[PDB]
């Protein structure tokens, strides 16, 4: 029952998204990104939006930036709940999954209230966001956030010090810092083993450079350390949500360049130029200036990136997606050396892999 070799065969969920995108305009490709990591949607579409904004040489408005950071943190909470609870369910413990999926449903309710879809919102659009927060959503977010801490603390009182959990994780999937860097790991696959890296701090995007949050780092480098790291990341996400709620500013929500973002419907209905802009935007789309870029974000799993090459048309020329988990599932073998089948089942969870992103 000892694992002598791991040969991850993937591609069972590959649907040629990278080639499909090349045939669709820049607005028509955004929904794909919400499906690349179906667990953390808005962060993927945030990566796309930042990349396209970089190429367009335009800047999102302040309220849109704050909203994007807020919903990015909510998405990070969603991803961490999924990772931790599915990991626990596969290891054996089952109750925390049911406990926490109620809060996942509440966060989905926020998702739907803002975007009209419980996931795959397509809310974040190159230029800012599609629509402004419906009144009261901040109040509901406050009500949810003020209590989420107690629920995470209950999950911790279940799992943190339990001898069974500690024996089932500790000193499992131990990866050295140099080996991780060479293997190309990212996110918690790096911070767990002592490496002090987090793009939100090192290379900030949006308004991550105006909110204070700590970055948990692990010492042992094993599954238990990384589970603790994810829980602490959830707590820091609550911190950031508090700050965003308190500092949400007034103003527009989408770049006020009607050649990039659609004009408001009333303007479309009473302005000639605005109607022309609506027509061309929703038919031909924007014309992104030629160039190439590699935008990176600290997606709830790791470092979600887009290498985008544009030739001046309204459709991208090439859109490679660097999924955080690709290198992780590549390094599964190294991590699983000298472990049993159960340990391997544990090891796969720490990676927190979504094969939507793995396969692209």
């Amino acid at each position: 029952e000892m694992v002598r070799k791991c040969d991850p065969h993937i591609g069972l969920l590959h649907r040629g998204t990278e080639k499909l995108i090349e045939y669709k305009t820049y607005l028509q490709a955004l929904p794909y990104f919400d499906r690349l990591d179906y667990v953390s949607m808005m962060c993927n579409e945030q990566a796309y939006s930042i990349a396209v904004e970089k190429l367009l040489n335009i800047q999102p408005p302040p309220r849109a930036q704050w909203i994007r950071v807020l919903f990015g943190e909510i998405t990070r909470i969603l991803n961490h709940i999924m990772a931790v609870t599915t990991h626990a369910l596969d290891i054996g413990a089952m109750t925390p999954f049911f406990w926490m999926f109620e809060e996942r449903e509440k966060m989905f309710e926020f998702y739907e209230r803002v975007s009209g879809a419980r996931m795959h919102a397509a809310y974040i659009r190159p230029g800012g966001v599609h629509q402004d927060l419906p009144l009261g959503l901040l109040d509901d977010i406050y009500e949810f956030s003020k209590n989420f801490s107690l629920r995470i603390d209950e999950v911790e009182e279940m799992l943190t010090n339990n001898r069974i959990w500690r024996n089932r994780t500790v000193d499992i999937g131990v990866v050295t810092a140099e080996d991780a860097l060479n293997y190309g790991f990212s996110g918690v696959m790096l911070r767990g083993s002592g490496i002090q890296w987090d793009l939100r701090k090192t290379q900030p995007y949006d308004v991550y450079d105006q909110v204070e949050f700590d970055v948990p780092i692990g010492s042992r480098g094993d599954c238990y350390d990384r589970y603790l790291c994810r829980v602490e990341e959830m707590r820091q996400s609550l911190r950031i949500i508090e700050q965003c709620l308190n500092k949400m500013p007034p103003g527009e929500i989408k770049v006020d360049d009607a050649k990039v973002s659609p004009p408001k419907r009333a303007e479309m209905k009473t302005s000639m130029e605005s109607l022309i802009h609506h027509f061309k935007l929703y038919t031909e789309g924007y014309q992104v200036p030629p160039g190439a870029t590699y935008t990176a974000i600290e997606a709830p799993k790791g470092e979600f990136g887009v290498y985008l090459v544009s030739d001046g048309s309204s459709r991208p020329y090439r859109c490679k997606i660097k999924a955080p988990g690709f290198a992780h599932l590549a390094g599964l073998d190294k991590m699983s050396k000298g472990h049993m089948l159960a340990d391997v089942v544990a090891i796969i969870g720490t990676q927190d892999i979504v094969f939507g992103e793995i396969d692209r």
Partner: protein, 178 residues
């Protein structure tokens, strides 16, 4: 800014009271008992489930569901063959074949939506310049046969007639945001 999550700090502190506490922890299963207590505490809490059939959960006016084609109060299909809906639909689910009418009017003679290809994205309802195509509140339209999921202008218009009230209310309550 970083905070250690699990770094062992000061070690020399060994005491008789500490040792008996540790031995009690190991032998008596204290943390396991505590987890059991947590589970019981949950046992005595009101369930979070809902009797779904007679109690649907909340949905906001922006909710995207089964499509519909609206009408003017006079009773006329708003569809003016914009064709922008068909141009923007990312999944290419809309098919429009339009011809001039006997009234010297622009209308559509084949409006088909493949609801097995639509991704329920709302791009049509937001790129319709006369608010013809909308995504109504309905979310229960599962069918036994595939061919019943290939919609047509008729079925869409009957859905519009059926849901006109709720579609009207949502549009009324949301148009300011749009």
């Amino acid at each position: 800014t970083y905070k250690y999550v699990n770094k062992k700090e000061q070690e020399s502190e060994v005491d008789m009271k500490s040792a008996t506490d540790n031995a009690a922890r190991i032998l008596m299963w204290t943390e396991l008992i505590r987890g059991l207590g947590m589970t019981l505490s949950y046992l005595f809490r009101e369930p979070a489930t809902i009797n779904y059939p007679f109690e649907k959960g909340p949905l906001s006016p922006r909710f995207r569901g089964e499509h519909a084609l609206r009408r003017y109060p006079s009773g006329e299909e708003r569809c003016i063959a914009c064709k922008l809906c068909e141009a923007i639909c990312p999944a290419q689910a809309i098919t429009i074949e339009a011809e001039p009418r006997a009234d010297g009017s622009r209308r559509t003679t084949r409006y088909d939506i493949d609801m097995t290809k639509c991704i329920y994205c709302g791009f049509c309802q937001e790129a319709c310049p006369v608010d013809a195509i909308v995504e109504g509140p309905n979310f229960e339209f599962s069918t036994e046969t595939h061919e019943e999921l290939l919609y047509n202008k008729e079925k869409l218009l009957n859905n519009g007639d059926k849901w006109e009230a709720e579609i009207a209310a949502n549009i009324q309550a949301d148009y300011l945001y749009r």
